[PDB]
Amino acid sequence: DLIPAPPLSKVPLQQNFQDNQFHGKWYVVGLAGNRILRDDQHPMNMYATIYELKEDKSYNVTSVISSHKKCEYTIATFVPGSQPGEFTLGNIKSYGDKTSYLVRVVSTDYNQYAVVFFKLAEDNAEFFAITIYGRTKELASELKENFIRFSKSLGLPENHIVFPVPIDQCIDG
């Protein structure tokens, strides 16, 4: 009963993506997906994701999260796909022919915001998400409004969209 992944034709690709300008820390200002669910009783804390450029053009992707009495860092590798602005998992081959993972930078101005699309496809299910990053913990209202419209255009109702609450713990380190 999970909302199906939208056709990739509805997900724009940032033109002439510049990897040497996209590196750095990006705060998660907005997050939507077929598994995301807004609950005012359980607001989500904001976290950050750092894109560290490697010599081979892939990115080390570090997410900084504020956990119970400590800060944590997750690690992932985004390997360049067929087009600039697209990537796949560094260990995707270890999942099998039926599993695929796509990262697509939808739109970014490198120094203010970035909209990224994620799609994990498996034999009998697809999980996709859209996130809007900010170089700061806050973004102009219009940018967030466009994010909501874009999310809906992908078949996501408004309650499948959350805006993490800004925090000072661990995400600024």
Binding site: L37, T49, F127
Partner: protein
């Protein structure tokens, strides 16, 4: 992400409680981490944690009071070694750790009341 769990469970005379924490379908590739937090007298402590793939037996730290299995969109947990002083609200935190994007859900918790057995 909505995380469901029983509101109340009474620990057995042997100090054991078994309940389920359900959440959104994780899929097969997603690495999930479940963390059990104990809230009592406004204080919060981490009881146990395990990272797993859907459908596997969970591996908690050695000498841990938690054991369980993952099936479908839920974790089937058993917490043992409980004593009256351990009475409290046991909250399930379920995180989608890998691959990106990081996301999570937190349950309202399962209140576990513990009564110590009689000295006979």
């Amino acid at each position: 992400m909505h995380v469901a769990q029983p509101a109340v469970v009474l620990a057995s005379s042997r100090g054991i409680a078994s309940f389920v924490c359900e959440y959104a379908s994780p899929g097969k590739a997603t690495e999930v981490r479940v963390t059990v937090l104990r809230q009592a007298d406004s204080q919060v402590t981490e009881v146990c944690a395990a990272t797993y793939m859907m459908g596997n037996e969970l591996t908690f730290l050695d000498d841990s009071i938690c054991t369980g299995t993952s099936s479908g969109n839920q974790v089937n947990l058993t917490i043992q070694g409980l004593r009256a002083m351990d009475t409290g609200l046991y909250i399930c935190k379920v995180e989608l750790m890998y691959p990106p994007p990081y996301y999570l859900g937190i349950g309202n918790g399962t209140q576990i009341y513990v009564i110590d057995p009689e000295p006979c």
